[PDB]
């Protein structure tokens, strides 16, 4: 059995550690499948227009 | 002390400078041709 | 080069309030002091949702439309 | 013919309101049908009289185009957002800005109020949606996970409480409490620029230039596919009688049956006299609280007002 | 001229710094990602390049040539089962990109795994792709053997793509493999199925040519 | 998240105009387009704005009419913003209100 | 029958482009100035 | 579906099948299937949130 | 004797060129009936699998199969690398570029605007007249 | 005419011209430090140098922002790849990079010109 007391914080105490440090944005969640329609067909003439 | 008669050399440099700088930068073209100002280069073009 | 467009914006989620309050900073603006700390609500005469619920809007709208058309007619 | 569609009477323009000096980009109706806001690219917000069509007030204060405007139903407030990056609360008791919501990294494209909690939600071009407390002007959550600009957002009281489409052709159904995506719907091929909520049937619609889709709410099931209005559509709005309005960037506007998915009217309105043929376009449309007027904010700096035709059936497919 | 591996690692430092800086600059269009992955695969350090393609798919997972380069790196460097996982994840996340299906049914056929290519084709006919996909699966069968299973594929294809040209092609198939009675059964099934008021000439033209 | 205060206003407007044009051309191209060619349409829009300011009649000989109509639309929008800003600053300079010196030179150049 | 530049009527009338049944409203400056408010306090 | 849910949980709902692409039927009328759940459940979720 | 003509039309799609390339590769391949009948007799009931039978995580290809795949894929990479053939560079034409990229941009200008700007070049070559 | 040709040739500004010269100077000081370090390793003197930077040494040491390839439905734990042959008696800085685009094209242009002028 353990008795836990929260440490008493000094009011006259500035911030302790540097926070401005920055690392690049991590990977996003696993890619969702697209569920698209079957690729409507493209013609040479409209591709040229 | 600018202007006078136009020679073929100045006119061909004027043609090539219009090919490079366009018809809306005449003080960049007239820096390439001494004794000719920007109004003179524009007038000679048109 | 130096002079260039954007073609993509800067994304949000990595500064001052975004995920861990930027790890709990002790820096705060003068625009972030307490101000207007009490939401005003609609009273019974204003347009409270108790009064808006039973109202037939089409009859009142048609009456106001008729009065506006009559005012525009009687003007000229 | 598997369904038989309900007959809806056709709509007709009866009032062209004019006076903005920029594209009218948003519109919203007051809870009591006394007036309605518009916001435009002339950096102002205009209170218009809904009966007489007369300009009731003009409110300056934005630095750029006004993109979304909404009137609160619980509180006497007027929330507005812009390309300014500024989100504002207008106290209508004083007609002055009392609170500004800071933190969007880029332009703010839309905003919506939660109907029961006093929580504002906003879309931005920085690929995020933000969740704001009205009283404390602070960011509760930052809904991130879209990869392009976020175009439209809505709110419920019931499940998934935040639905947003964006320019990455996806739609995320979220958790307001956790701040994380529940369903990513990728069925569209081009950018979703308008989502809309049905008042009764617990489904929603979503629009993109390929086609428009109807969807059940708990987990997003496919239900239907409303097609034929193939332009870049900007807004969708639902009538409780099951009338759906799709207005596009080319000025074309189609009127639709919600249930059967039938196109009963096509409306191609004409531009203002000084205006140009390439300038026909709809950015917003909204029904009034009587649901018998249709207010469209046009790209020819006009507000066009439509009402139903009182002549009987000349119609039915 | 480079000596022992100190100067080689210095050259690698300069090149990887240049590529990672270009990635930091743009973070968009994948030419930097692909060029850095090609440079890493050219030095047989392909785990670096696996990481590069996974990072680039974290950036843009809908870019199909990125999938193609990653899977062709893993096929090229004799890592069959990696590339097999890559194609499976590719056809899962992008089911409408027919490129992935054609290349993955081609890889399973070139590796001698017949039944694996059969299972990938059946997963592909679950999506009901297009005319050319069904014809490619028929050509896969007819390339091996199995006129009966290819006939079952034709039955599915005429049931899921009702079109007179497809019935004509299946009729021409049943002609060319000498099953004229089966072809006649297909004819008597087609002319009853199309009805009376819809038909264009070509069905009865080809059926008259057969009975000619 | 820096605020668009007074010296960022034109740069923010012309930052957002480009983005709106980018979203419109990503929605306007059909399904089988190579998804390149955005930078060229943006250059056509900048050149169309320069030709509006110079009062030069702007016509590209071969160009698709949706791109040409969209460029004309956004050039009319930037024309409206330019002209209304000029009217506002001219009324301010006339009444004697607090104006910058640079806005006096810019306003003379617009007028 | 000469038309001066001071008239030079382009852009035909709003009644001519929308018709008689559509009523056109041109609104410049507004009723009830910014001191006179929207939704009124309980006095 | 298991190759689609790499980093997701077991209760995450994602769509990866072709049966998710076909439209449902007309769902005729005021059906108790497509209903906003319950007004007391709405108040309960409102209070929780 | 056989004869088959297959020219190319315009580009129009990334999938049509894929389909053409697939038809080329899939007509070039030859199946081995010995290995086919061997694997058929070894596998039996499951040699005609459905979408969901069992064998997904079982096959281990021997060295000859992976060598054939690698050689075929190297040939395919070579055929892809021969896609854009360089047109021969003549220096007799009057050059109108000062850079290496300026030449290709002027070529693109002659591609697009070359049909419309056909009178002014005649005016230039006749002496800025007409 | 000389100023005309010299100004029709130019496209670069101040910063591009100072960066090109800075790149040449960086290449020169790199070859000089390379020669000094090669001599110190050839005779054999193990003087170590310093480094004062946060990032940058993370490139050769390990995989920078490593993502593991997603795994499923096929065992891929047994197979591995073979490292590159070193061959540090023929290998050059040009060899790892591959032939230059301007170099190859330049070469052909040469050949093309030759044939045309010879014919
Ligand atoms: Mg300079």
Curated annotation (Swiss-Prot), chain C:
Comp. bias intervals (Polar residues): 22-32
Transmembrane segments: none
Modified residues (Phosphothreonine): 45
Record's compositionally biased regions (Basic and acidic residues): 50-76
Subcellular location: Nucleus
N6-acetyllysine found at: 16
Domain of life: Eukaryota
Family statement drawn from the similarity comment of this UniProt entry: Belongs to the CWC15 family.
Subunit structure: Identified in the spliceosome C complex. Component of the PRP19-CDC5L splicing complex composed of a core complex comprising a homotetramer of PRPF19, CDC5L, PLRG1 and BCAS2, and at least three less stably associated proteins CTNNBL1, CWC15 and HSPA8. Interacts directly with CTNNBL1 in the complex. Component of the minor spliceosome, which splices U12-type introns.
Function noted in UniProt: Involved in pre-mRNA splicing as component of the spliceosome. Component of the PRP19-CDC5L complex that forms an integral part of the spliceosome and is required for activating pre-mRNA splicing. As a component of the minor spliceosome, involved in the splicing of U12-type introns in pre-mRNAs.
Protein name: Spliceosome-associated protein CWC15 homolog
Origin organism lineage: Eukaryota, Metazoa, Chordata, Craniata, Vertebrata
Positions spanned in the full protein: 3 to 78 of 229
Curated annotation (Swiss-Prot), chain E:
A GO cellular component entry from the record: nuclear speck
Transmembrane segments annotated in the record for this chain: none
Highest taxon in the source lineage: Eukaryota
Residue ranges that the Swiss-Prot or TrEMBL entry lists as coiled coil: none
Keywords attached to this entry: Acetylation, mRNA processing, mRNA splicing, Nucleus, Phosphoprotein, Repeat, Spliceosome
Stretches forming HAT repeats: 10-42, 44-76, 78-110, 112-143, 145-176, 178-212
Tissue/organ expression: Widely expressed. Highly expressed in testis. Not detected in brain and lung.
Localization, UniProt: Nucleus; Nucleus speckle
Annotated GO biological process: mRNA splicing, via spliceosome; spliceosomal complex assembly
Keyword set includes Nucleus: yes
Entry keyword Phosphoprotein: yes
GO molecular-function terms, A-Z: RNA binding
Family: Belongs to the crooked-neck family.
Free-text function comment from the UniProt entry: Involved in pre-mRNA splicing process. As a component of the minor spliceosome, involved in the splicing of U12-type introns in pre-mRNAs.
The protein's assembly and partners: Identified in the spliceosome C complex. Present in a spliceosome complex assembled in vitro containing CRNKL1, HPRP8BP and SNRPB2. Component of the minor spliceosome, which splices U12-type introns. Isoform 2 seems to be predominant in the spliceosome complex. Interacts with PPIL2 (via the PPIase cyclophilin-type domain); they may form a trimeric complex with HSP90.
Protein name per Swiss-Prot or TrEMBL: Crooked neck-like protein 1
Classification of source organism: Eukaryota, Metazoa, Chordata, Craniata, Vertebrata
Gene: CRNKL1
Residues of the full protein shown: 213 to 424 of 848
Curated annotation (Swiss-Prot), chain F:
Superkingdom of the source species: Eukaryota
Tissue localization of expression: Widely expressed.
Annotated localization: Nucleus; Nucleus speckle
Record text about domains: The MPN (JAB/Mov34) domain mediates interaction with TSSC4 and SNRNP200. Has structural similarity with deubiquitinating enzymes, but lacks the residues that would bind the catalytic metal ion.
Pathological condition linked to this protein in its record: Retinitis pigmentosa 13: A retinal dystrophy belonging to the group of pigmentary retinopathies. Retinitis pigmentosa is characterized by retinal pigment deposits visible on fundus examination and primary loss of rod photoreceptor cells followed by secondary loss of cone photoreceptors. Patients typically have night vision blindness and loss of midperipheral visual field. As their condition progresses, they lose their far peripheral visual field and eventually central vision as well.
Protein name: Pre-mRNA-processing-splicing factor 8
Part of the whole protein covered: 669 to 779 of 2335
UniProtKB/Swiss-Prot annotation, chain G:
Modification type Phosphothreonine: residues: 31
Similarity field: Belongs to the TRAFAC class translation factor GTPase superfamily. Classic translation factor GTPase family. EF-G/EF-2 subfamily.
Assembly description: Component of the U5 snRNP and the U4/U6-U5 tri-snRNP complex, a building block of the spliceosome. The U4/U6-U5 tri-snRNP complex is composed of the U4, U6 and U5 snRNAs and at least PRPF3, PRPF4, PRPF6, PRPF8, PRPF31, SNRNP200, TXNL4A, SNRNP40, DDX23, CD2BP2, PPIH, SNU13, EFTUD2, SART1 and USP39. Component of the pre-catalytic, catalytic and post-catalytic spliceosome complexes. Component of the minor spliceosome, which splices U12-type introns. Within this complex, interacts with CRIPT. Interacts with ERBB4 and PRPF8. Interacts with PIH1D1.
Secretion signal, residue range per the UniProt entry: none
GN (gene name): EFTUD2
Residues in coiled coil: none
Record disease entry: Mandibulofacial dysostosis with microcephaly: A rare syndrome characterized by progressive microcephaly, midface and malar hypoplasia, micrognathia, microtia, dysplastic ears, preauricular skin tags, significant developmental delay, and speech delay. Many patients have major sequelae, including choanal atresia that results in respiratory difficulties, conductive hearing loss, and cleft palate.
Subcellular location: Nucleus
Protein name: 116 kDa U5 small nuclear ribonucleoprotein component
Membrane-spanning residues: none
Position of the Glycyl lysine isopeptide (Lys-Gly) (interchain with G-Cter in SUMO1) cross-link: 9
Cross-link Glycyl lysine isopeptide (Lys-Gly) (interchain with G-Cter in SUMO2) placement: 9
């Amino acid at each position: 059995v353990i008795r836990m007391v929260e440490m008493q914080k000094d009011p006259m105490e500035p911030p302790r550690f540097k926070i401005n440090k920055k690392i690049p944005r991590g990977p996003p969640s696993p890619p969702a499948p697209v569920m698209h329609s079957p690729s409507r067909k493209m013609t040479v003439k409209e591709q040229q227009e | 002390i600018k202007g006078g008669v136009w020679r073929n050399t100045e006119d061909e440099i004027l043609k090539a400078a219009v090919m490079k700088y366009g018809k809306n930068q005449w003080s960049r073209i007239a820096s390439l041709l001494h004794r000719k100002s920007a109004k003179q280069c524009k007038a000679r073009w048109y | 080069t130096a002079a260039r467009p954007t073609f993509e914006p800067a994304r949000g989620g990595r500064g001052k309030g975004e995920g861990d309050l930027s790890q709990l900073s002790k820096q705060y603006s003068s625009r972030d002091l307490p101000s207007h700390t009490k939401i005003k609500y609609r009273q019974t005469t204003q347009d409270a949702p108790e009064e808006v619920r039973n109202r037939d809007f089409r009859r009142e709208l048609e009456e106001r439309e008729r009065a506006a058309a009559r005012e525009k007619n009687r003007d000229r | 013919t598997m369904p038989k569609p309900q007959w809806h009477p056709p709509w007709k323009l009866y009032r062209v309101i004019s006076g903005h000096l920029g594209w009218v980009r948003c519109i919203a109706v007051e809870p009591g049908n006394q007036w309605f806001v518009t916001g435009s690219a002339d950096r102002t917000i205009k209170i218009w009289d809904l009966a007489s069509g007369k300009l009731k007030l003009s409110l300056t204060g934005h630095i750029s185009t006004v993109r979304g405007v909404i009137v609160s139903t619980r509180s006497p407030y007027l929330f507005s957002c812009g390309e300014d990056k500024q989100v504002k609360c207008w106290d209508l008791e004083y007609n002055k800005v009392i609170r500004h919501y800071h933190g969007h990294l880029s332009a703010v494209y839309g905003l919506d109020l939660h109907p029961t909690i006093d929580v504002l939600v906003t879309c931005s071009r920085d690929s995020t949606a933000r969740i704001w407390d009205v009283r404390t002007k602070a960011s509760v959550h930052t809904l991130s996970g879209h990869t392009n600009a976020v175009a439209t957002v809505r709110c419920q009281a019931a499940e998934p409480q935040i639905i947003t489409g964006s320019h990455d052709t996806t739609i995320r159904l979220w958790d307001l409490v956790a701040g994380k995506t529940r369903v990513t719907l990728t069925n569209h091929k081009k950018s979703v620029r308008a989502v809309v909520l049905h008042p009764r049937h617990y489904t929603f619609a979503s629009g993109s230039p390929d086609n428009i889709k109807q969807w059940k709410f708990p987990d997003g099931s496919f239900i239907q596919n409303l097609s034929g209005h193939n332009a870049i559509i900007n807004t969708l709005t639902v009538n409780s009688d099951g009338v759906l309005v799709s207005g596009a960037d080319n000025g074309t506007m189609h009127l639709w049956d919600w249930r059967t998915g039938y196109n009963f009217q096509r409306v191609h309105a004409a531009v203002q006299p000084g205006s140009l043929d390439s300038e026909s376009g709809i950015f917003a449309c909204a029904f009034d609280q009587s649901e018998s007027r249709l207010l469209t904010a046009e790209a020819d700096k006009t507000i066009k007002v439509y009402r139903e035709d009182d002549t009987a059936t000349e119609e039915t497919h | 001229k480079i000596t022992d591996e100190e100067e080689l690692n210095d050259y690698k430092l300069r090149k990887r710094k240049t590529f990672e800086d270009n990635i930091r600059k743009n973070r968009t269009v994948i030419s930097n990602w692909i060029k850095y992955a090609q440079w890493e695969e050219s030095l047989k350090e392909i785990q670096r390049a696996r990481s590069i393609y996974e990072r680039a798919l974290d950036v843009d997972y809908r870019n199909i040539t990125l999938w193609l380069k990653y899977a062709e790196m893993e096929m090229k460097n004799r890592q069959v089962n990696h590339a097999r996982n890559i194609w499976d994840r590719a056809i899962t996340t992008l089911p409408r990109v027919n490129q992935f299906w054609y290349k993955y049914t081609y890889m399973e056929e070139m590796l001698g795994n017949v039944a694996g290519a059969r299972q990938v084709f059946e997963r592909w006919m679950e999506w009901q792709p297009e005319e050319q996909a069904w014809h490619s699966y028929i050509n896969f069968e007819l390339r091996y053997k199995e006129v009966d299973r290819a006939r079952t594929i034709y039955e599915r294809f005429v049931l899921v793509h009702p079109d007179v040209k497809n019935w004509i092609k299946y009729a021409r198939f049943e002609e060319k493999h000498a099953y004229f009675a089966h072809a006649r059964k297909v004819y008597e099934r087609a002319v009853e199925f199309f009805g009376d008021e819809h038909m264009d000439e070509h069905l009865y033209v080809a059926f008259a040519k057969f009975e000619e | 998240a820096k605020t668009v205060t007074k010296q960022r206003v034109e740069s923010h407007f012309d930052l957002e105009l480009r983005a709106a044009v980018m979203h419109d051309i990503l929605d306007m191209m059909p399904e089988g387009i190579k998804q390149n060619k955005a930078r060229t349409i943006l250059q056509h829009l900048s050149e169309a704005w320069r030709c509006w300011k110079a009062n030069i009649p702007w016509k590209v000989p071969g160009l698709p009419t949706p791109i040409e109509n969209m460029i004309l639309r956004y050039v009319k929008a930037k024309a409206d913003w330019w002209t209304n800003t000029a009217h506002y600053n001219r009324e301010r300079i006339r009444r004697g209100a607090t104006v910058d010196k640079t806005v006096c030179k810019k306003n003379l150049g617009r007028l | 029958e000469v038309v001066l530049h001071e008239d030079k009527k382009y852009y035909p009338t709003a009644e001519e482009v929308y018709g008689p049944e559509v009523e056109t409203i041109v609104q410049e400056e507004d009723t009830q100035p910014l001191t006179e408010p929207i939704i009124k306090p309980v006095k | 579906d298991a190759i689609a849910r790499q980093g997701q949980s077991k209760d995450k709902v994602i769509y990866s099948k072709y049966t998710d692409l076909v439209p449902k039927e007309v769902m005729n009328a005021d059906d108790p299937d497509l209903q906003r759940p319950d007004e007391e459940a709405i108040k309960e979720i409102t209070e929780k949130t | 004797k056989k004869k088959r003509k297959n020219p190319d039309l315009g580009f129009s799609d990334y999938a049509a060129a894929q389909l053409r390339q697939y038809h080329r590769l899939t007509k070039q391949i030859k199946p081995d009936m010995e290995t086919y009948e061997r694997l058929r007799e070894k596998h039996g009931e499951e040699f005609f699998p459905t979408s969901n039978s069992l064998l997904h995580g079982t096959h281990v290809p021997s060295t000859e199969e992976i060598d054939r795949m690698v050689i075929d894929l190297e040939k395919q990479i070579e055929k892809r690398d021969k896609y854009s053939r360089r047109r021969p560079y003549n220096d007799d034409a009057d050059i109108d570029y000062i850079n290496e990229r300026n030449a290709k941009f002027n070529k693109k200008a002659e591609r697009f605007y070359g049909k419309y700007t056909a009178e002014i070049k005649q005016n230039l070559e006749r002496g800025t007249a007409v | 005419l000389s100023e005309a040709r010299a100004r029709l040739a130019n496209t670069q500004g101040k910063k591009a011209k100072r960066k090109a010269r800075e790149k040449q100077l960086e290449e020169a000081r790199r070859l000089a430090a390379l020669q000094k370090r090669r001599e110190l390793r050839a005779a054999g003197i193990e003087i170590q140098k310093k480094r004062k930077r946060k990032r940058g040494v993370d490139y050769n040491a390990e995989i920078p922002f490593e993502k593991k390839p997603a795994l499923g439905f096929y065992d891929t734990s047994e197979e591995n790849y073979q490292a590159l042959d070193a061959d540090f008696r023929k290998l050059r800085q040009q060899d790892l990079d591959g032939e230059l685009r301007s170099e190859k094209e330049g070469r052909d242009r040469k050949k093309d010109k030759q044939h045309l002028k010879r014919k």
